[PDB]
Amino acid sequence: KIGSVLKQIRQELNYHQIDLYSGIMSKSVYIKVEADSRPISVEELSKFSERLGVNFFEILNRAGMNSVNETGKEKLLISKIFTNPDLFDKNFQRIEPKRLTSLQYFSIYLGYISIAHHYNIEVPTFNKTITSDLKHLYDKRTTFFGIDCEIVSNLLNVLPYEEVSSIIKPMYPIVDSFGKDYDLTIQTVLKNALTISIMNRNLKEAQYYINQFEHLKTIKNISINGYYDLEINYLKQIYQFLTDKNIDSYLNAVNIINIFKIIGKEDIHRSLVEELTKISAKEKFTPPKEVTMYYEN
Amino acid sequence: KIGSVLKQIRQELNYHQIDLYSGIMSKSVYIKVEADSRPISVEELSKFSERLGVNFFEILNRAGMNSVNETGKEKLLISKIFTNPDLFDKNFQRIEPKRLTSLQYFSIYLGYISIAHHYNIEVPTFNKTITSDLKHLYDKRTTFFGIDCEIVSNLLNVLPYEEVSSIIKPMYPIVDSFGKDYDLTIQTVLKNALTISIMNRNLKEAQYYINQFEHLKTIKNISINGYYDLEINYLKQIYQFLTDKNIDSYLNAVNIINIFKIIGKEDIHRSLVEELTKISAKEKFTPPKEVTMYYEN
Amino acid sequence: FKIGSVLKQIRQELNYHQIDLYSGIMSKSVYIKVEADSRPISVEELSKFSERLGVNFFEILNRAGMNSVNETGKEKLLISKIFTNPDLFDKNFQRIEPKRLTSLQYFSIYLGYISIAHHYNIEVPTFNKTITSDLKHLYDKRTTFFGIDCEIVSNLLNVLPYEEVSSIIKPMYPIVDSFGKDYDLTIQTVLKNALTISIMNRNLKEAQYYINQFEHLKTIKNISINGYYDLEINYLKQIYQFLTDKNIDSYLNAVNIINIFKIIGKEDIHRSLVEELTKISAKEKFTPPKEVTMYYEN
Amino acid sequence: FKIGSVLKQIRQELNYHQIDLYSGIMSKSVYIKVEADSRPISVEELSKFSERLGVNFFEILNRAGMNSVNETGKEKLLISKIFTNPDLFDKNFQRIEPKRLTSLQYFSIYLGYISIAHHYNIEVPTFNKTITSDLKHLYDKRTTFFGIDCEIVSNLLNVLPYEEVSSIIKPMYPIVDSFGKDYDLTIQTVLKNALTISIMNRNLKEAQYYINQFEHLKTIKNISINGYYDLEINYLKQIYQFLTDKNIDSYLNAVNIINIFKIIGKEDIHRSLVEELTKISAKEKFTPPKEVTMYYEN
């Protein structure tokens, strides 16, 4: 695992075992470490990382951090259980019972409900446990983690906005960045929440989500997702159009859609076209020739 | 420092030591961990994280991994020195001699050369030892890591392209994704290399980087940077315009430039506006009124 | 008119001798008097000499001074001067007012004074006291209308509520025959002005009426459609389509047309269309494009 | 020549009595002769009746049939019929060719035949043998020009290399006065046609000269600029800028102007600009927009 990578990197850079442990451990010890016959401490790994000149996280990854365990395998199975709605039937009953085991499982669990709804598969236990499920996990909370934000995105997917809004408010504003993985998760929520708000025409909530996203850009070391920046700005154009039928705003929205096509993000392009169509219809306003043409197909 | 977070998280989620150590370590020892009196091992933290349901890296990041060691501290000093060119000499004298101690230090070293070049400061040893420095670091190399890609971006900024190209080729194509941090770094090289290629009108090289970037989009679990993807596409639009003077390609590029403005990414926008003005001039083309309105100012 | 002298100028410029012009048409002696401008020339004779010279009949007339000459031209000309210097109004208006029904021309000039007065806020009480009676006197028995009638109608849309004029316009359309470029322009001005007012009052059925009348003109043989009018009217049509079924493409087309007027240098028109679209957009609670608002604002 | 009866129709239409017309111009017995078309009318007399009626002089003439009358007019109409019926060529060219120098109108008509001949690839060997001679005979000692002179030029540009006509055009501009809407059109057509050709031959120096000459026309008193030409000449001005320094904005403007012609329904012009833009693009080794390329091929 880790020790093997250390040896791999060490020799690649032409460093001798000595160069690594010299002032950190015994040569006899460092030997067992590279042999993976002895666990290494986070501290130690951090020192070798500095010694090697190769980023810590990368080393962890090269060692297999990118999957590795139960929850991992279980999480991977969802996209698989997706394509095969038969893989559902069996799996669902193995997860449902342990849905409150950990937040990771509750997310995984919600992953099935999403599939279940998609393939109109009946889930009678869902409607009678979700509420109490949510309370047992969020009634007494102060700090929220990436997994919680992952959970919210999922809830917004298989639950009425009003039934989830309660859980989201306590999560924002965010004031600290805890890594790129964490950064992504906290943006996804806002993107999901904003879309829905725009669609329900709940401008008050839309404005708040737009603001929460903007605030994120002010955090130190934050890693904003360009696609999101692009999509959330599209939703902002729509917001301004809904708020006062600004013509430029509508054009900016349309041009942003066109950019997604140009760069090849077809799924998002489709989504945003159907979205603009559905939005314009409600406002009883016909979208330009370009968009109506696209959506027609 | 990890134990506090583990306790904090365990506490927050309402878990007992039992729920964490059971099947792993003795509650006696586990107490020492949450006490941070006993260094924890990667394998242990990984197990705990799964038990907690909170991502391994989010935990390490909350623990403080974001810098800590002398290499990191030296890294942050680079920006402080950019704002105050006065700090150069004194600090450079400390770094320059250590530029080969490790790949991180060499990278840090290149940052100084960049500061130097910007403020037209004299760094006569650089042209005296750079070629020799590269030979020493990359002659016997067979594989590369994030830091090597970072070093390459650095070199591209303070050295003629031709003196860097050979060092770059053996680094691509990338086959695996080793985390979001590493993913971003492998993408930065391609964006800088492609920009310089376009600017020098080296179409053969420009098209190689465009293809290498596209290849990254096929890698499992790869995390593509939205801003880079939009920017490389702009470079691709320029590429097509230089290849067979297409009007739509020029319009697309200009359009993409415009979206960076609309979404608030002003530095990229300024950068692209300047670049298009120079590209246009070399092709005896007058840029759109708007683009020259920004650059000119 | 100096028709004879123009014939001499042209005849000699083309190297023709007097014989080449008068043989078969009039005696040598009489033709000499014609070129000396001491003998009236008949329309047919001029048309004949015109064909001989190979120079267009109308061009010759114009060169002779039909570009103005008589009492009615002097008066219609006087309007421009009085517009800049309204101190002249009063005394001249006292001469015109009484003669406003002498002919359709004088009536047209008369409305020219009313327009001026409405502008510099001058009091013209006689107007409201006689207008309805004048229009009836001029149009109660009519069956066919002429260019000057369409000029009058246009002048009325300028100093009278739309409704008091509309009923007078309808009987003049549709147009069936073209009677020259001057006539063509005049019959077109009415529609453009009428359609502008119709769109401004969101009167959609009236707007379509005029849009239809204008479009029908394009089916007339030898008609001279005014390009500027075709552009402006088409912009009003784009606005009509937006007002009917909030079509964005129609809104863009209109904005794009306003932009064309800017490019080719028609500022006054560009100016008026920007103001127009700004008011149209407000009533519809739509914020016009960045472009338009920058111009209007300034 | 149906003036007298038109005056009668108009007079009665406006409910005027003969007295109102001839009072102070002629006698009752004479004016009667005038309305029955038994006595020709002088230009001065028609101008006077025209003012009494309040109807425009030129409109009265056109209502009287001034739109044709004489043999030259007949030869003019016969051209359109020959363009569609090429089989009518020979017999009519035999009658016209020998009369091509009878007058400037006949020369213009003759040039019309040559155009039709080139279109349907019909042999006209005399043309190439006599053209230089004809031009020399017609323009060697000329000092001032008329509308028919600019028509001939537009005609020449249509059947003669640009260099054999360039020097014949120069002495005709700048125009200084306007001589009626008909004349106004003709003098603009030359510059529009000349510019188009210059742009296609990439003769930027000449193109600039025509762009300037057109602009000068706008400063002329009472001039009637043709909106379509104004829009099309601005288009050429945009292509000019593009050919001079490859200005991207200029190219976009050219494209936009093409869009406008499509928007307002001028399909012939749209098709033409689409085609010229395609050719000018291919020559500059530049691929035109997605919009035009499709419209062109299809």
Query: Long-range contacts: B274-278, Cβ < 8 Å, 24+?
Result: B275/B195, B275/B198, B275/B199, B276/B238, B278/B199
* Domain ranges in chain A with CATH number 1.10.260.40: 1-64
Chain A nearest-CA distance from C150, in A, is: 38
Query: Is D263 in Cβ contact with C257 (below 8 Å)?
Result: yes
Q: Name, in order, each residue with C-beta under 8 angstroms of D40's C-beta and a sequence gap of 6 or more.
A: C42, C43, C44, C45, D1
Q: Can you list the alpha helix ranges (DSSP code H) found in chain A?
A: 2-12, 17-21, 27-34, 42-52, 56-60, 70-83, 85-95, 103-118, 124-127, 130-138, 146-157, 162-168, 180-200, 203-216, 226-244, 247-262, 266-282, 289-296
Helix, coil or strand: residue C234: helix
Q: Which CATH architecture has domain B67-297?
A: Alpha Horseshoe (1.25)
Would an 8 Å CB–CB cutoff place B11 in contact with chain A? no
Q: Which DSSP string corresponds to A152-173?
A: HHHHHHSS-THHHHHHHGGG-S
On the question of a cis peptide bond just before residue D174, with omega within 30 degrees of 0, the verdict is: yes
Q: Is D38 on the interface with C (CB under 8 A)?
A: no
B41 forms bridges with which residues in the sheet? A41
Q: Which residue of C has its CA nearest to A286?
A: C247
- Sort out which chain A residues have CB atoms less than 8 A from B54's CB and list them: 103, 145-147
Q: Do chains B and D touch (3 or more CB pairs under 8 A)?
A: yes
Experimental determination technique: X-ray
Cβ atoms of D178 and C86 closer than 8 Å: no
Question: Nearest by CB to D227, which of C147, C228, C253?
Answer: C228
Q: How far apart are the first and last CA of chain D?
A: 49
Angle C208-C213-C219 from CA coordinates, rounded to 5°: 130
Answer for the pair D262, D274: CB distance below 8 angstroms, yes or no. no
User: How far apart, in whole angstroms, are the C-alpha atoms of residue C251 and residue C254?
Assistant: 5
Instruction: Tell me the sheet residues that pair with B286.
Output: D247
Tell which CATH architecture fits domain C1-67: Orthogonal Bundle (1.10)
- Nearest CB among A43, A55, A57 relative to B39 is that of A43
Burial of residue C149 (number of CB atoms within 10 Å: 0-12, 13-18, 19+): buried
Judged by DSSP in three states, A222 sits in coil
Cα gap C145→C63, rounded to integer Å: 29
Q: Do B246 and D287 touch (CB under 8 A)?
A: yes
* Both structure tokens of B48: 């705990």
d(CA D259, CA D263): 6
C181-200 vs C204-217: helix crossing angle, rounded to 10: 160
Strands (E), B138-260: none
Calculate the dihedral angle through the C-alpha atoms of B140, B145, B149, B152, rounding to the nearest 10 degrees. Answer: -20
For residue B121, count other CB atoms closer than 10 A to its CB.
14
* Residue contact D148–C61, C-beta within 8 A: no
Angle made by CA atoms D105, D106, D111, in degrees to the nearest 5: 100
Dist CA B192 CA B225 (whole Å): 14
Chain D residue numbers with beta carbons less than 8 Å from the beta carbon of C251 are none
Chain B residue with CA closest to A260: the answer is B230
Residues A226/A185, Cβ–Cβ less than 8 Å: no
Could you say which residues from 227 to 246 on chain C have a Cβ atom under 8 Å away from some Cβ of chain A?
Answer: 245-246
| CA–CA separation, C62 and D222 (whole Å) | 12
Which residues of chain B lie closer than 8 angstroms to D287, CB-CB?
A: 244-248
Q: Do C248 and A286 touch (CB under 8 A)?
A: yes
Judged by a CB distance cut-off of 8 A, whether residue A9 touches chain B is: yes
Residue of A nearest to C249 (CA): A288
CATH architecture of D68-298: Alpha Horseshoe (1.25)
Cβ distance B251 to D286 less than 8 Å, yes or no, reads no
CB contact under 8 A, D246 and B285: yes
Chains C+D touching (3+ CB pairs under 8 Å)? yes
Residue A218 sits at the chain B interface (C-beta within 8 Å): no
Please state which architecture CATH assigns to domain A66-297.
Answer: Alpha Horseshoe (1.25)
Helix (H/G/I), strand (E/B), else coil: B139? coil
Cis peptide before A85 (omega within 30 of 0): no
Those residues with Cβ within 8 angstroms of residue C137's Cβ, 6 or more apart along the chain or in another chain: C101
- CATH 1.25.40.400 maps onto chain C at 68-298
Pick from B243, B251, B273, B286 the residue to mutate for testing the D interface (most D CBs within 10 Å): B286
Residue A205's φ and ψ, nearest 5 degrees, are -70, -35
B-interface mutation test, from D249, D255, D291, D294, most B Cβ less than 10 A away: D249
Bridge-partner residues for A169, per DSSP?
none
Which is it for the CA torsion A187, A189, A194, A196, positive or negative? positive
- Rounded to the nearest angstrom, the minimum Cα separation between B245 and chain D is 5
Contact D55 C104 (CB under 8 A): yes
Task: Name the CA dihedral angle for B138, B141, B145, B146, rounded to a multiple of 10 degrees.
Answer: 10
Q: Where are the alpha helices (DSSP H) in chain C?
A: 3-13, 18-22, 28-35, 43-53, 57-61, 71-84, 89-99, 104-119, 125-139, 147-156, 162-169, 181-200, 204-217, 227-244, 248-263, 267-283, 290-297
Task: Please name the chains neighbouring A, where neighbouring means 3+ C-beta pairs under 8 angstroms.
Answer: B, C
**Long-range pairs of A166-170 with CB within 8 A, sequence gap ≥ 24:** A167/A134, A167/A138, A168/A193, A170/A141, A170/A144
- Residue C285: list chain A partners with CB under 8 A: 244-245
Neighbours, chain B (3 or more CB pairs < 8 A): A, D
Question: What does the DSSP 8-state code read for residue A61?
Answer: I
Q: Does C10 touch chain D (CB under 8 A)?
A: yes
Q: Give contacts of C228 with chain D, Cβ < 8 Å.
A: 227, 230
CATH number for the segment(s) B1-66: 1.10.260.40
| Shortest CA distance from D287: residue in chain B | B246
Residues 6+ apart with CB under 8 A from C206: C166, C194, C198
Query: Which two tokens mark A224?
Result: 């904003």
Say if the Cβ atoms of D43 and C42 lie within 8 Å. yes
Cβ–Cβ below 8 Å for B289 and D249: yes
The CATH number that domain A1-64 falls under is 1.10.260.40
CB-CB: which of A244, A246, A250 is closest to C248?
A250
**Please, how many CA atoms are within 13 Å of residue B91, restricted to the half-sphere of its CB?**
23
Check if B166 contacts A (Cβ < 8 Å). Answer: no
Q: Is B30 helix (H, G, I), strand (E, B) or coil?
A: helix
Closest residue on chain A to B233 (Cα): A263
Spell out the long-range contacts of A246-249 with Cβ–Cβ below 8 A and sequence spacing 24 or more: A246/C287, A247/C251, A247/C255, A247/C281, A247/C286, A247/C287, A247/C288, A247/C289, A248/C287, A248/C289, A248/C290
Nearest alpha carbon to residue A143 among B58, B8, B20: B8
- The Cα D122–Cα D89 span in angstroms is 9
Q: Is D34 helix (H, G, I), strand (E, B) or coil?
A: helix
**Which residues on chain B are in Cβ contact (under 8 Å) with D286?**
245, 247
Domain with CATH 1.25.40.400 in chain A: 66-297
Contact check, Cβ <8 Å, B286/D251: no
Give CB contacts under 8 A, 24+ apart, made by A75-78.
A75/A104, A75/A107, A75/A108, A75/A111, A78/A108, A78/A111, A78/A112, A78/A115
Task: Check CB contact of D210 with chain B, cutoff 8 Å.
Answer: no
Q: Which of D249, D285, D289 is closest, CB to CB, to B248? A: D289
Q: Which residues contact C297 (CB under 8 A, 6 or more apart)?
A: none
B251 contacts chain D (CB < 8 A): yes
A-chain residues near B135 (CB < 8 A): none
Option in B247, B284, B285 nearest D287 (CB): B247
Q: Single out the residue of C185, C174, C123, C117 nearest to residue C148, CA to CA.
A: C185
Resolution, given in Å to one decimal, reads 2.2
Q: Is there a contact between A175 and A159 (Cβ–Cβ < 8 Å)?
A: no
B228 contacts A229? CB cut-off 8 A: no
Say which of C248, C255, C286 has its CB closest to residue A288.
C248
B250 and D248 within 8 Å at the Cβ level: the answer is: yes
Q: Contact, C159 vs C119, CB < 8 A? A: no
